[PDB]
Lethal(3)malignant brain tumor-like protein 3
Amino acid sequence: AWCWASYLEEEKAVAVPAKLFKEHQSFPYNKNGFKVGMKLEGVDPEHQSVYCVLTVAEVCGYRIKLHFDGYSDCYDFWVNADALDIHPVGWCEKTGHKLHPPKGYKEEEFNWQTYLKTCKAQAAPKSLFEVIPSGFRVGMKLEAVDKKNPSFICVATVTDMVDNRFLVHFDNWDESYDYWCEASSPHIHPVGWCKEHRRTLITPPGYPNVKHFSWDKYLEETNSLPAPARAFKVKPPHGFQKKMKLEVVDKRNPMFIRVATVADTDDHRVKVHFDGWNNCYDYWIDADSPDIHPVGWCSKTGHPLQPPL
Amino acid sequence: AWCWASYLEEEKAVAVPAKLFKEHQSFPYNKNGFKVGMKLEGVDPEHQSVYCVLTVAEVCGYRIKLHFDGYSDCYDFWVNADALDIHPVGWCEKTGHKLHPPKGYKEEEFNWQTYLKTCKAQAAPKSLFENSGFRVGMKLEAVDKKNPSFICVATVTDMVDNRFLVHFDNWDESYDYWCEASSPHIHPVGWCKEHRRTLITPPGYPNVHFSWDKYLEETNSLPAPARAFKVKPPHGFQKKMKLEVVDKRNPMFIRVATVADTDDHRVKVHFDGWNNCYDYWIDADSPDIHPVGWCSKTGHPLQPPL
Ligand SMILES: O=C(c1ccc(C(=O)N2CCC(N3CCCC3)CC2)c(Nc2ccccc2)c1)N1CCC(N2CCCC2)CC1
Ligand SMILES: O=C(c1ccc(C(=O)N2CCC(N3CCCC3)CC2)c(Nc2ccccc2)c1)N1CCC(N2CCCC2)CC1
């Protein structure tokens, strides 16, 4: 047995006001309709340009553990039931996307209608998944932070777009560095931002001009258009204040949601500290992550919460 | 309070025998000569083609926590005092290697002798560092450790002693990795055709109808001789056996671990008292896995089962 009200009194602290959490982080207004064994399509979190054949492996509160059919369960991952990068069976085909078939299946030999029959499986219904016009369009070029090497701002392209969300690709870099985002992302910048902020812009591998890079030459050579400066929107500040409490998914063992504290604040990030555990477990995370939640999110959703160690 | 002896009688299991461990995993012959502040050169574990200016941030047991000078403490990493990818000050200049200087330092403006006199620091004494058929330029077929389904066209781009650096042609260098002649991840040219596997050709190469012969002449390189690739005998680690394993998630800690599952060259470590979702695979010749008593013998704290 463990209550937040008693804990906030004992510690003499305040929770991050619920009003500071966005719709995808806040209390769901509905129940989790997903059931184990339901099939769907979805983005690979490690290879974000790839759509894979997924199966609901576990249902816990408002979250689902997704399994990559035919692949090892060591690759299994957690998402909320309202996640944006999960889609119903037939979505890739209807929206013009390439779907990676299960392991040992060739694209040219994969059919959903026949696969669900073979598996004696049911597709996750379309309703379990049930836009402000942005300036971004597929093919558009900008400057973006390589989230894996954050000291690098590179030449990038919008290579995919789903509703108001788009996939950032780094030209002539492999696709494992790709990531999804939106107009207000603090990681994306318009062409010329780097020169303006006295920053080095990392140029495409194999591109002869490294130190003498011209955006206008590159845009002619690639027959591309730049993302308009006006398509980029201001990210309002989160407002989360140091020492404030919340609920955070453990990056390490994501099956758990733990009692967290805002250890330190950034302009768009927060430093999660898991109460009881040592300061070495602390890490940075975006304050608009669907993996950070308000106090009682676990209690309300039916998700077990890990009290302080 | 905790002991391995009482734990072995209570849980009714026998430990991974001392003999089954390699020289870099077993009980060391000497004490830890390193001290906090000592400066050195060493390979970046996440960019294995890069040599960096390091400082002994922390000394604990037969281990050292190393700091990348000028860069965040968030990149600090742990190695054993007898690690092979750490070198004394001046080694890169001696061996014609490229040393990456501290943050904000240009290669053209860095000098150890002056840098040490600026940080009022001492170099790690050379004495602390006194611990193959492959040659630099040789081509082989290697497994991409980050994406193991992939076997690709690779070159040996560096060689230090009997250890060499595997680089994937026309892929970024963050995929590079150091290994030895007995590694299961490396194979001779033609092993994929021979084993009815797909060989990942270099990005930008026209074919993927790929030819190793056209490519070897184009690049003007030699393929590693099939004889240089040496056989690795199996570890002999039976399931339920006990040992000490460095936690990958928080490597400042070494914990009580069981051999949950076994492979030909790998073992599935299970941290006792923890959920099976913490369990991970690891090479059996890893210097992060040690025999029962290694922490107590070296002065490193051991983590009991949770
Ligand atoms: O990043 C990759 C990579 C790795 C893997 C897949 C892949 O086979 N996928 C199917 C299986 C899936 N999940 C399901 C279960 C968990 C893994 C990942 C996507 C992949 N495919 C792909 C094809 C087309 C377009 C873009 C990507 C590309 N490489 C750069 C790094 C490369 N290596 C660098 C060193 C040598 C090669 C290897 C390829
Ligand atoms: O792999 C890299 C990479 C990343 C970083 C460094 C780097 O700045 N280094 C200095 C600092 C050090 N440590 C010290 C503290 C921890 C980090 C690593 C080496 C680097 N340099 C380098 C130059 C020459 C030769 C080989 C490497 C290349 N990229 C492919 C992936 C790239 N991104 C892909 C998407 C867009 C860009 C970015 C660059």
In short: The first helix of chain A runs from residue 4 to 11.
